[PDB]
Amino acid sequence: GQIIKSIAAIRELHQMCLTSMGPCGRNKIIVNHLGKIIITNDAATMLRELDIVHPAVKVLVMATEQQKIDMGDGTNLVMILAGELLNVSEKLISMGLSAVEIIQGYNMARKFTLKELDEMVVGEITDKNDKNELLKMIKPVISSKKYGSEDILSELVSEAVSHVLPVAQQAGEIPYFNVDSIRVVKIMGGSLSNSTVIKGMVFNREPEGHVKSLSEDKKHKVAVFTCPLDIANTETKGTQIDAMMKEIADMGVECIVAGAGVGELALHYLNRYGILVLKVPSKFELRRLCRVCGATPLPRLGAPTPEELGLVETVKTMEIGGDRVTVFKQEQGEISRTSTIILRGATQNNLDDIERAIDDGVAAVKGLMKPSGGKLLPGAGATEIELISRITKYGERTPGLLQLAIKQFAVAFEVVPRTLAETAGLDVNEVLPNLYAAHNVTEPGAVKTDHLYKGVDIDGESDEGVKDIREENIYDMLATKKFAINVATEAATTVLSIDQIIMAKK
Amino acid sequence: AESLRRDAALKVNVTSAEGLQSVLETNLGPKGTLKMLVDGAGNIKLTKDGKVLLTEMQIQSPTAVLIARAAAAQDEITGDGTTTVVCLVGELLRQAHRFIQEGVHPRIITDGFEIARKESMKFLDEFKISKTNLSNDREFLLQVARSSLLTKVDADLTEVLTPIVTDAVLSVYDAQADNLDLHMVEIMQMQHLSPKDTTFIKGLVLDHGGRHPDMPTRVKNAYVLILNVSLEYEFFYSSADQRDKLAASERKFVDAKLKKIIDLKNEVCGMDPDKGFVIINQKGIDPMSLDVFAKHNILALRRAKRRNMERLQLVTGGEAQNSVEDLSPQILGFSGLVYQETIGEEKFTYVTENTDPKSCTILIKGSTHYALAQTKDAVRDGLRAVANVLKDKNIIPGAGAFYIALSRYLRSANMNKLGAKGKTKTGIEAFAEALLVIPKTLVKNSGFDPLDVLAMVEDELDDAQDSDETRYVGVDLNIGDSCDPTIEGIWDSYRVLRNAITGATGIASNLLLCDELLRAGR
Amino acid sequence: KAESLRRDAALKVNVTSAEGLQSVLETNLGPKGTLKMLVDGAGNIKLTKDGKVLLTEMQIQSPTAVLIARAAAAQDEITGDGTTTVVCLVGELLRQAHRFIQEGVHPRIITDGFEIARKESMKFLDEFKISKTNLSNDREFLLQVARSSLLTKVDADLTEVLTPIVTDAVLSVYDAQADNLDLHMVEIMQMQHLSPKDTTFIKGLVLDHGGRHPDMPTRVKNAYVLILNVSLEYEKTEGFFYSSADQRDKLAASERKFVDAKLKKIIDLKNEVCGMDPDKGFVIINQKGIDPMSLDVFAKHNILALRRAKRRNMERLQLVTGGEAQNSVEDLSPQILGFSGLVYQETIGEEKFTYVTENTDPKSCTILIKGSTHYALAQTKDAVRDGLRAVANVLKDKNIIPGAGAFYIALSRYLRSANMNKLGAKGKTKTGIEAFAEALLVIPKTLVKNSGFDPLDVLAMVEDELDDAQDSDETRYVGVDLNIGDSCDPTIEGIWDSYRVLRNAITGATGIASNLLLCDELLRAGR
């Protein structure tokens, strides 16, 4: 049985993710073959580092790539749903239900699940781009990464997000928020309260010039050059240095950036006269300077055409955690298209891992864009437990052997409320049966009131049963759920269809 | 060297065939499973296409290599029916091994296989149904794709690819004595959208987007220019004024070229409303010459493979201009909606609503190399499969009705014909038994009982015979009972079954006549 | 402490075993059959074509084969023949089933068809039989029956020898007035020093211990036989003192004179019953011994004298001539003696044997198995023990079945064409209708294979003639001709079979195959 051997393989990565997902989750130590210690809860980082052996794993891993590239969340939702969807299929296999009949069932359930998810909508983010509306989503996204640190990270992100979401109104066809709109840097030392946000670009390299600040005027004009700065060389061969700034400043420039090297006298004179000098090793970061300072790089040398100058409010050199950085930023004007997250933290693993979490929080806001992304679902398995009950109803409505598959299909959605419990340390022999009753009630009405809000208690508030998601404002993104169901349903269908693994001609 | 005798050669050959069958048995029918191909470097293919499976699979036994070579030859003739061959060949050899052990000389067996082949051509000619190619026969053409695509897809791409292939085919074959060329339909692949986002493009897609931030995205009713000469920068200064002139010097030669082009713009749809001007250049275009094209509301592309623009020479129908100094107002083609879509890196230019170039593109979308390979083959198999319908007006009732009903003719009428011989009658029986492997495997792969379904099929066959009516009896792989393929919509090919029965008869005859395995060259 | 196959491969094990019993016990079928050698390890060879010997005296390695063999052993104890056809029918029923098993047909469905065919097979058997009249002029048919059973077990040159022997033997035992026959009244004797073709039929009974004295008469034309139980050797009343050679015998002869007075009384019978009268004679067979001098006196009166008789043959000897066992010579009366014809003692240098023939009214006969070697005497002994039961099956059951496989051939045609048109089973169970009819060909097929004639072509030639009967509107009994290679008519050639054997052959073969096909797990006990 190839399908039996495949089940054995997925049991390995199922064990990996089963204990991973959740704010109470457990970290994994990952040793890079190049000599790096990686400790994270991100299963995408895990699978990137995990060598793949059994070809059936290649299906599940590439599935998580579809989720992670196309959606900034859902990594464990794919691995967790997929793991159990194939685990419960072992019962269907052993009951004698053929592979094609199991496949037909999961596809029939794909339609049932998607239609119900549309009915599970509780609220909707009205796209006010307000810090309060952002926090409603940013908090639960930061959750599952660092439990209890949401206060520090929420104030960091929601304020940083307001830097890259400018004042926009009547805008549903104008896209905003590129993933590169928020940069995160690492400064060894300090703690969470030592982190901050800069409204613009921060160079991790120490100040290279001798000038600390520009003038006090608003919208200090700035130049970027592409050609190497030296004594004017003729258009051909040749087998003035400082005169560049005499040309640049004509329009109002206090800051001169050189995308290339610097000539003899200018290295002294550009800084001597109080002008900031910059050369950037990252050429995409030069494209960032086009977005932060608004600077249009001059393709020629020593000829700052007026159209090749930008307007940047303030550029200064700043001290972060004792290690010096150079800041090219905007200030209440020519609003910066990039904001920088200043992470001060002493442990290089927690420091880097905090960045890994904030990177995902940035990605979540990309999904908070206009593509039908405001829809909210009830979190803490209220979506999952309610889906269980509604799926079993479709079983009663469905004649044939498809009834057997639908029944085992609902069982699979218990892995998410189970994982929330096993990681949190509440007895799965008590929390799970209390979840069933909390969501399974006889409502005097067609609208379940306060019974779609029943949650899973991951807090230390000792209580028999579970809590209400509105207490902490725990909502899940509908688009994350809907896309995840599509990925996992098709991914499990793929594994369930593998009848033989044949080596190609070699 | 190597030598095996006492008929052990026949025993070894059967072992190899029964194996190859067991490999590609579960790979048959709409209820079939998918096979994995592992390159060893990590590239994985998940496919049901026997043309891929037999070609790429490592074959350990040398006898099975013979069937693979023969089946591939059948693939390059009709273009479909690969697993049909492997299944037919395997059962022809198993049913024969039974009779070989009973004392029938292999020659007696193979002679009756040829006698039955002559009879199989008789039933095929009477069993075929001639259809018209009218444009309102999309009912039948849709059913053809719902037959051929259904096998290679997951039943959700059935509804997606059905209208995609159907319309792509009608774009090529005019309802008259015209022609059909599968190179007239382009197969394009891309990522960033789900498998079910595969779409039909009325015209041609260009992969290379331009490098300019103001490139116009929506261009309606525009003439199209293809240039083959570079419009980029084609020297001693002492000051800013002279430096600029040296840059303007070689760009001044471009400037005169741009002047003639913006004269071409002002000349052709310069004053015409709701119209515009598209330019594509084999070579580069200066970023300021792109500023000019943006200035005059012109769509520009550069640095493109002439082969892609060679199709544009057919699609838009203009004359490629090697020199802009010779630029002429009449060289331009026609185009409608031109859309430039943006993915994570490159932008794709959709050249659509074209006069009537008779060329179309199917845009395959998906996330991974897994599904892109599945659909890439599905589309190429479907376009070729439907082409066999427009090439040959004869369509065969599907659902195994050909392979089922032959069991009635071979058993009954030939015994009254007595057209063979008493001892060769053994082979007539072997052929009839083995033709049940196709309808039988289709049932086995569905989970339904392999014997009971055939019994229910036989009942309806008898009822229609006693009722003296024409009834095409098939297998319903959803309910489990019998069906009628002419009502349910399952169609098959005349030419495929002709080359399948005549090919498998030859393959099996060659294998049944194997006397000695002689190892030579060593 | 458990071993079993949760996979159905237990059927692959059981089928593999049956294929072995086929390849072993198949090649012995037919007058074109081969002979199997049983070696007992003590140096004795049993050369046999008989199935019962090959079933009961083979070392069985396969645990499944233990059942097929022990079950087939019940065939001989019911009908008395047919053990080989059971083994062959079982193997082919299991082999044709394996084909249908791999198609997914549950063993129940196959088994039910085996039972449905059994019900149909009883119809054919009763319709196909030929009712035989009880005319004692049936010698032609009875001779033909003997050839059917003999040509199988002997070399066809001993058939012309054993054919009149067995035929005339059973003609003697079969009682008139519709009374039964008793095969226990037909004696089978073992004698060495002659060739196998010398096996002979004796109208009466032959005794082991012959006369041991030079004056014993060679033969008596008209003999009157005495069975005497009196001790005629040295006895004494239930003091002997001699001082010289002269006084020894005077005392002992006086004590033996108690015998000699009976020796006088015995020759007083001889004088009472034809002492000197011609054409009359006196044969003495004594349970006890005869004194050497008592033999001399028995010679004095020309008496054929036998001594030290075996009790069980002596009990027969009362039945042989109809006389009485004499417990005292003083009670010796003239009418006690039994009358017989030619009585002679044939001299074999090992032991002279007494031939007591042409007896009063014994209704009993003896077949003397002649042959020099042990492997020859055993083969012949089986041929006689088998053929006597074959001719008994015909005289007991007036129904005879056309042989040469006409039963197994025609039953194929009737079950192939009619059953589905009868609607007598079911659509899915048709796999059993085909399985049984295909397996019915194992008997006519094996008969041809062992002859060297073309297996397929001979079966085809049989069917051609059977088709002629359909248009000819006549009964044509078509069988396999194992000599020329073509078809033949069993009723013209003389090949016959038994109603009761074929009845129990099909019944038993269905049972053995049904039990094996329904096997699920092989379990280990006591381990």
Q: Which amino acid is at C375?
A: Y
Q: Which two tokens stand for residue B267?
A: 């000349």
- The Cα of C53 is separated from the nearest Cα of chain B by a number of Å equal to 29
Q: Taking a C-beta distance cutoff of 8 angstroms, is the pair B267, B223 a contact?
A: no
Q: Which amino acid is at C361?
A: D
Which superfamily does CATH assign the domain made up of C1-132+399-527 to?
GroEL-like equatorial domain (1.10.560.10)
Alpha carbons B397 and B144: distance in angstroms, whole number: 11
- The Cα of A400 is separated from the nearest Cα of chain B by a number of Å equal to 10
- The Cα of A487 is separated from the nearest Cα of chain B by a number of Å equal to 10
Alpha carbons B74 and B499: distance in angstroms, whole number: 7
Q: Please tell me if residue A498 touches chain B, with a CB cutoff of 8 Å.
A: yes
3-state secondary structure of C522: coil
DSSP calls for B309-322 = HHHHHHHT----BS
Alpha carbons A431 and A418: distance in angstroms, whole number: 8
Inspect the structure and tell me whether chains C and A have 3 or more CB pairs less than 8 Å apart: no
Chain B from 429 to 488: CB within 8 A of any A CB: 445-447
- Reduce the secondary structure of B477-490 to three states and give it as a string: CCCCCEECHHHHCC
Report CA torsion sign: B499, B500, B503, B509: negative
Q: Which two tokens stand for residue A181?
A: 């709109």
| Candidates C428, C454, C456; nearest CB to B452 | C428
Measured CA to CA in angstroms, residue A388 lies from A77, A488, C134, C220 at distances of: 16, 16, 86, 112
Q: Among candidates A303, A304, A298, A310, which has minimal Cα distance to A336?
A: A310
CB contacts of A52 in chain B (<8 Å) are 42
User: Which secondary-structure segment (H or E) carries A316?
Assistant: strand A314-320
Q: Give CA A14 to chain center in angstroms.
A: 22
Contacts by A452-455 with C-beta closer than 8 Å and gap 24+?
Answer: A452/A120, A452/A122, A452/A378, A452/A382, A452/A386, A453/A122, A453/A378, A453/A382, A454/A382, A454/A385, A455/A378, A455/A379, A455/A380, A455/A381, A455/A382
Where helices occur in B45-137 by DSSP H, the ranges are 50-56, 62-75, 82-100, 106-127
- The Cα of A303 is separated from the nearest Cα of chain B by a number of Å equal to 7
With tokens 């002859």, the residue in question is C451
Query: What φ, ψ does residue A259 adopt, rounded to 5°?
Result: -65, 0
- Residues constituting chain B: 522
Q: Please tell me if residue B34 touches chain A, with a CB cutoff of 8 Å.
A: yes
Q: Which amino acid is at B201?
A: I
Q: Among candidates C187, C221, C229, C225, which has minimal Cα distance to C206?
A: C187
Strand order in the sheet with A276-278: A276-278, A253-258, A220-225, A309-312
CB contacts of B422 in chain C (<8 Å) are 457, 460, 464
Which superfamily does CATH assign the domain made up of A1-124+375-506 to?
GroEL-like equatorial domain (1.10.560.10)
3-state secondary structure of A475: strand
Q: Among candidates A377, A368, A370, A354, which has minimal Cα distance to A474?
A: A377
CB contacts of A235 in chain B (<8 Å) are 235-237, 243, 246-247
**Could you tell me which CATH number the domain at A200-333 has?**
3.50.7.10
Alpha carbons C4 and A46: distance in angstroms, whole number: 44
Alpha carbons A488 and A64: distance in angstroms, whole number: 9
Alpha carbons A398 and A401: distance in angstroms, whole number: 9
Query: What φ, ψ does residue A78 adopt, rounded to 5°?
Result: -70, -50
Q: Where in chain C is the domain with CATH 1.10.560.10?
A: 1-132+399-527
Alpha carbons C225 and C492: distance in angstroms, whole number: 48
Alpha carbons A182 and A169: distance in angstroms, whole number: 21
DSSP calls for C348-363 = -SS--EEEE-SBSS--
Closest Cα in chain B to C454: B103
What is the domain partition of chain A in residue ranges? 1-124+375-506, 125-199+334-374, 200-333
Alpha carbons B30 and B155: distance in angstroms, whole number: 9
CATH 3.30.1490.20 fits B132-202+358-393, yes or no: no
* The listed CATH number (1.10.560.10, 3.30.70.380, 2.40.160.60, 1.20.210.10) that belongs to domain B1-131+394-522: 1.10.560.10
The helix-helix angle for B157-170 and B138-152 (nearest 10°) equals 130
Alpha carbons B447 and B78: distance in angstroms, whole number: 30
Alpha carbons A240 and C463: distance in angstroms, whole number: 117
CATH fold match for the domains A125-199+334-374 and A200-333: no
| Ranges assigned E (strand) in B373-518 | 394-397, 474-475, 482-483, 491-493
The last residues before gaps in chain C (C-N over 2.5 Å) are 238
Q: Give CA A148 to chain center in angstroms.
A: 19
Q: Where in chain C is the domain with CATH 3.30.260.10?
A: 133-203+363-398
- The Cα of B163 is separated from the nearest Cα of chain C by a number of Å equal to 40
A–B interface: beta-carbon pairs under 8 A:
101
Look at phi and psi of residue A37 and say left if phi exceeds 0, alpha if psi is from -120 to 50, else beta. beta
Q: Which amino acid is at A183?
A: R
Q: How far apart are the first and last CA of chain C?
A: 6
CATH 3.30.260.10 fits A125-199+334-374, yes or no: yes
With tokens 């990177």, the residue in question is A359
Closest Cα in chain B to A70: B192
Q: Among candidates C137, C140, C136, C160, which has minimal Cα distance to C150?
A: C160
**Could you tell me which CATH number the domain at C133-203+363-398 has?**
3.30.260.10
DSSP calls for A265-313 = HHHHHHHHTT-EEE--S-HHHHHHHHHHT----BSSSS---GGGEEEES
CB contacts of A497 in chain B (<8 Å) are 33-34, 46
- The Cα of C114 is separated from the nearest Cα of chain B by a number of Å equal to 18
Measured CA to CA in angstroms, residue A59 lies from A56, A407, C425 at distances of: 5, 25, 51
With tokens 């019915």, the residue in question is C440
User: Which secondary-structure segment (H or E) carries C498?
Assistant: strand C496-498
For residue C309, give every residue at least 6 positions away whose Cβ sits within 8 Å of its Cβ, in sequence order, or none. C207, C209, C227, C285, C286, C287, C317
| Chain B residues in contact with chain C using a Cβ-Cβ cutoff of 8 Å | 98, 102-104, 422-423, 426, 444, 449-452, 455, 458-459
3-state secondary structure of A406: helix
Report the residue of B97, B451, B481 to disrupt the C interface, i.e. the one with the largest count of C CBs within 10 Å: B451
CB contacts of C457 in chain B (<8 Å) are 422-423
CB contacts of B446 in chain A (<8 Å) are 98, 100
Alpha carbons C505 and C496: distance in angstroms, whole number: 16
- The Cα of B120 is separated from the nearest Cα of chain A by a number of Å equal to 33
| Candidates B98, B423, B455; nearest CB to C457 | B423
Alpha carbons C111 and C378: distance in angstroms, whole number: 40
3-state secondary structure of A471: helix
Alpha carbons C247 and C252: distance in angstroms, whole number: 9
Judged by CB atoms closer than 8 Å, whether chains meet at A55 and B36 is answered as yes
Q: Taking a C-beta distance cutoff of 8 angstroms, is the pair A475, A68 a contact?
A: no
Alpha carbons C365 and C354: distance in angstroms, whole number: 14
Burial class (CB in 10 A: 0-12, 13-18, 19+), C501: buried
For residue C486, give every residue at least 6 positions away whose Cβ sits within 8 Å of its Cβ, in sequence order, or none. C458, C461
Q: Where in chain B is the domain with CATH 1.10.560.10?
A: 1-131+394-522
Q: Among candidates C258, C236, C240, which has minimal Cα distance to C249?
A: C240
Measured CA to CA in angstroms, residue B346 lies from B283, B311, B373 at distances of: 18, 20, 21
The helix-helix angle for B494-512 and B369-391 (nearest 10°) equals 110
Query: What φ, ψ does residue C445 adopt, rounded to 5°?
Result: -70, -50
* CA atoms within 13 A of residue A183's CA, in its CB half-sphere: 23
Q: Which two tokens stand for residue C349?
A: 């240098």
Q: Which two tokens stand for residue A433?
A: 């049966």
Q: How far apart are the first and last CA of chain B?
A: 6
Please state whether beta strands A28-31 and C496-498 pair in parallel, antiparallel, or not at all (unpaired).
unpaired
Closest Cα in chain A to B56: A504
DSSP calls for C229-282 = -S-BSS--------SSHHHHHHHHHHHHHHHHHHHHHHHHHHHHTTSS-TT-EE
DSSP calls for B161-230 = HHHHHHHHHHTTS-SSS----GGGEEEEEE-SS-GGG-EEESSEEE----S-TT--SEE-SEEEEEE-S-
